[PDB]
Amino acid sequence: LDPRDPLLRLSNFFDDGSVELLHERDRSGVLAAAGTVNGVRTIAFCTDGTVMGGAMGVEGCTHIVNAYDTAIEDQSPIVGIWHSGGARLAEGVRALHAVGQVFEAMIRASGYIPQISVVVGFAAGGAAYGPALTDVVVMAPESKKSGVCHIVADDELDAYDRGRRLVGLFCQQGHFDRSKAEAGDTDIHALLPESSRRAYDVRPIVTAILDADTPFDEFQANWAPSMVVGLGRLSGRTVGVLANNPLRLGGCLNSESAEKAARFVRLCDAFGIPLVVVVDVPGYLPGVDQEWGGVVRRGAKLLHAFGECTVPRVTLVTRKTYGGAYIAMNSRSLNATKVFAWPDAEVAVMGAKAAVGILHKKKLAAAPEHEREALHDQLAAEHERIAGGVDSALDIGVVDEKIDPAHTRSKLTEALAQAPARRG
Amino acid sequence: LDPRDPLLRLSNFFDDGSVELLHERDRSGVLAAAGTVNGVRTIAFCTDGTVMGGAMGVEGCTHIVNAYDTAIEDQSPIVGIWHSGGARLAEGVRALHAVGQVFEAMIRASGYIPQISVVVGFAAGGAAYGPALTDVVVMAPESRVFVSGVCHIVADDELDAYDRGRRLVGLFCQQGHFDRSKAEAGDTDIHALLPESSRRAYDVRPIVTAILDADTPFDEFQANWAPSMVVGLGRLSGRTVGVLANNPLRLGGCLNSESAEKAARFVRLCDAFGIPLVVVVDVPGYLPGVDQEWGGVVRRGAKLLHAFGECTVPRVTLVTRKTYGGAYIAMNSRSLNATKVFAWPDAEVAVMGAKAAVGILHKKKLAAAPEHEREALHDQLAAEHERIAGGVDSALDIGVVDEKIDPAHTRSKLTEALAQAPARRG
Ligand SMILES: C[C@@H](Oc1ccc(Oc2cnc3cc(Cl)ccc3n2)cc1)C(=O)O
């Protein structure tokens, strides 16, 4: 059989022997079917790369729409397998219309049933926008469109594999397990650099929080690299993680990271998936040139996403969190479920040196130039002794609890478990 | 510092003698008040630029939050007047928390009561992000936002800024009703505004203004951002409507990343407040960034599909000259549940232009043809393709256009469809 055969593709995705066609096979360019993915009833459709290179037509789109109606009715996840040059030129406006009806079905399904796209071949035009409307896009390398693909697989087979795991993440979310959280506790603080000025990759910290032999399904690893987001399991339960990554742009927020974070927050909130927000961010940045439009607009959207969120969302401040960025990273003012801080964490308007340069500008300016750098450092030291600490923020109430980093897992799990499924 | 006195500014904005302060005056850096705007009960607050440059602190932010709670409780529009360098740094994290609570209030109000910002001075940091969370930002030129599409309306001066601020609350809060007699009395031959040649570019704005009431301003949003797309509020037979229109004068009228984003936000705004939409379509395609980055147009375009697809206010489409391909689907097509789709007689609804279509469908015959005859062949191939594809009659047959109309009744036909639609569904 040709490798592009849609029944072959469907069969490699679904549980063995579970495939049930939803319609008679034809020359429409689409084959849709029901089946199971590790037991859970799932709907899927596959564009047929053997007919007109998978081009989307009236009858094909109609099968997709029927599959969507079926999935919506049964509340089943729906998975599309894509390989298609786009709309069938010969079918004219009729095909355009039919493609649009696919979009409208996906929009009706949005936030109601999970939608996973597995792009296994070239996908252009309507076949690029189709996946763009779904919740998670898995791409095989054999298939610039920056930020559109969430997960890059090794090949086609690995792509169905990640696709299958995603069905489990969304449809078998499970329960938190306090005993497993404690059993996985480690000293996560040890993963930080000795110097508080040195940059590090946050991912080992994310990995240490999540269950040990469970994959971290990171989204968009190569887009907006100053932000890390993705799905995993914490004591068996599906969680989404967001984490500033000091390794890139000093972990600062900017237009694309804010966009990446906001979309991820909205996706998890839509499906009842609780969030862990690992914060270590000194500030935020404009684009090339000094354009602030993006980070203002996207930043606002980030605020909106956390603000309206109802799933549990717990913040952990590892090292430092400053200013407006502090506010946007799931702060108490935006109704965070709980905010924890490691012992040596700093929560402040800005660095003590910068703070002092502003608060004592005139004293510093009026001081003799030779006594000045010493005066600045002395004032900073005294500022730092009364402002910035965890104990100050505790006092104000914007940090709920300072925690031993050896208890990060259990503490996080405990806070998430005590929150309602929906409120805040 | 008299001119930046908040009471003065609040008084310059509200109807004369309607100011009722919501709290004792102080040095918190904000003053909040209730009042009227052409009789509509309105809540407002002004940052106090005479105190530490309007810097935002715990007490001031608290007044803003109580103002929001009052507006939300009484379902009143709320207007912020902004002049602030940022947060009261000496308050430390306390100030950060307080500014966040302002954001959180704006979020609670989002889509529930109209929020209008009037930026009259330097607005930085938190004072930049606050207005970004509201629905319409008006900016006086004697000012600057800092920490691009963030400003929707640029006024002539501070008083002009208050005047537009005031008109805006009228658009949101006194939306009125459609009026057939007035719609018809304003009918003109709108098609006459197009060039003779279907290949010439033109500014779509006179077409929009021809549709809207003759003696009523068209409040265009973001005129200098995403210029291939025009959006804005105006009145149609006295009724507040939103207008979206591709503008052929810029980038051929093509969709792209920021035009899709501009359109999507505007759709969601009108949908939130029960404001019906007129979509004027003349779009031949869509574009990547000039570096060939398609990411934006894909992500933002999908957001436009979503905005129209979920929309429940009435929304009617008018195809004037052409609508092609994927851009056709996105511009409030029947497949996304458009309320009604009108087309002018010579309009084209198609996958692409006939010349382009044939060039693909018959690439081989064309390339085989002798060089001095390949042009006559291309043209005869095109003419026969458009005998059978692309016209309004065909589109009527398929069902993607509901009615071909005489352009001289454009304004009244649009009014009729919007007026007779359910206020919610589709
Ligand atoms: C000290 C500083 O205080 C600020 C600065 C900004 C601010 O508000 C926001 C809001 N959303 C943001 C979102 C992102 Cl992605 C980044 C930064 C953001 N900042 C709130 C307080 C200032 O006033 O000078």
Ligand SMILES: C[C@@H](Oc1ccc(Oc2cnc3cc(Cl)ccc3n2)cc1)C(=O)O
């Ligand atoms: C012939 C052509 O047909 C298309 C192309 C694209 C398409 O889907 C969309 C969806 N949203 C869009 C949004 C915008 Cl702002 C622009 C273009 C958009 N296109 C649907 C059909 C193709 O398949 O090649």
